[PDB]
Write a structure and sequence with these properties.
IsozizSyn; mainly alpha; binds magnesium ion; Terpene_cyclase-like_2; Epi-isozizaene synthase; lyase; 17 helices; Isoprenoid_synthase_dom_sf
Length: 339
């Protein structure tokens, strides 16, 4: 039973969950990949890895993706989570020197993953491994776009580092622009393309309906995460959260911020439903009778479909993952899966 303050009746009724048939293998393989790359201690993987439901999230998102593509996505996503934890630990312990170097190593590895497959820092090598595999599905033009988007993500994380060390709480609009990058909105949007096995031309993917649908899907997830991860981010001295920016600047109380974030989350859903019609109508326009048009039509249709899936997958992920179960920790400021 989902708590009233986090419950979204629309998602439960209009957004039915889906699950990739490869998921059972996905869960085990990703777990093994975390062990082989040494991204987590062997006992924390045994204890927490499956309870984190990182593979569950992506398997309910990228439906119709080839197994190898889904695996690379899941491994990358798992790295993304342990990088968020390393980023958090570097801040609380004030390891600015360690962070700046890692930051630099990630930029370089992003451009040439092969050269960093066996780097001394396992976090860098784990990153290089998943990125190299992601670069093997689609032509170089896609890889370049991916790198370009993730270069921005790293800098956003660096910007987050400086804000938390100084104690600066971003403005509500300053946060919303930063949140699009720290949540990696366009990374997950790009990953839709190898999932449908097709790189979309700019004329297609920058179509207003496609753009808006992709955006709204990411905004919902990012903002619902802020709503659900709020208690664990309060206890961990995290300052990057929509609710926190409201309380700090707009002087809203703890309950006023929750309700305010809820309404923004609810708007995303109904706004998505409106543009989803336009996005799917555009998919029907692409099918002009040609083989090419048919391929582009199917890809967009599958992508928009996965944008929809994200809603249900994220929603149930925040109530099934042990990542946010702060109420069951001995030390609320230190998650047990984090080292
Ligand atoms: Mg975090
Ligand atoms: Mg973050
Ligand atoms: Mg969060």
């Amino acid at each position: 039973a989902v708590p009233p303050s986090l419950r979204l009746p629309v998602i439960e009724a209009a957004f039915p969950r889906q699950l990739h048939p490869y998921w059972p293998k996905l869960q085990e393989t990703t777990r093994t990949w975390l062990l082989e790359k040494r991204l987590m201690p062997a006992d924390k993987v045994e204890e927490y890895a499956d309870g984190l439901c990182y593979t569950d999230l992506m398997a309910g998102y990228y439906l119709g993706a080839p197994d190898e593509v889904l695996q690379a996505i899941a491994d990358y996503s798992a790295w993304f989570f342990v990088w968020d934890d390393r980023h958090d630990r570097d801040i609380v312990h004030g390891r600015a020197g360690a962070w700046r170097r890692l930051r630099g190593l990630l930029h370089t590895a992003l451009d040439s993953p092969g050269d960093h497959l066996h780097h001394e820092d396992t976090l860098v090598a784990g990153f290089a491994d998943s990125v190299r595999r992601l670069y093997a599905f689609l032509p170089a033009t896609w890889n370049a776009r991916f790198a370009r988007h993730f270069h921005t993500v790293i800098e956003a994380y660096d910007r987050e580092f400086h804000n938390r060390t100084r104690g600066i709480v971003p403005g509500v609009e300053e946060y919303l622009e930063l949140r699009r990058l720290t949540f990696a909105h366009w990374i997950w949007t790009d990953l839709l393309e190898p999932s449908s096995g097709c790189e979309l031309p700019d004329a297609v993917r920058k179509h207003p309906a496609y753009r808006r649908a992709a955006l709204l899907s990411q905004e919902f997830a990012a903002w619902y995460n802020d709503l659900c991860s709020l208690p664990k981010e309060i206890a961990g001295d995290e300052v990057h959260n929509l609710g926190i920016s409201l309380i700090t600047h707009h002087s809203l109380t703890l309950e006023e911020a929750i309700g305010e974030v809820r309404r923004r989350v609810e708007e995303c859903i109904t706004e998505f439903l409106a543009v989803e019609r336009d996005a799917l109508r555009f998919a029907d326009e692409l099918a002009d009778g040609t083989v090419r048009g048919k391929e582009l039509s199917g890809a967009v249709r599958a992508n928009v479909g996965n944008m929809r899936n994200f809603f249900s997958s994220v929603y149930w992920f925040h109530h099934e993952s042990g990542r946010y179960m702060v109420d069951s920790w001995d030390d609320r400021s230190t998650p047990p899966y984090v080292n």
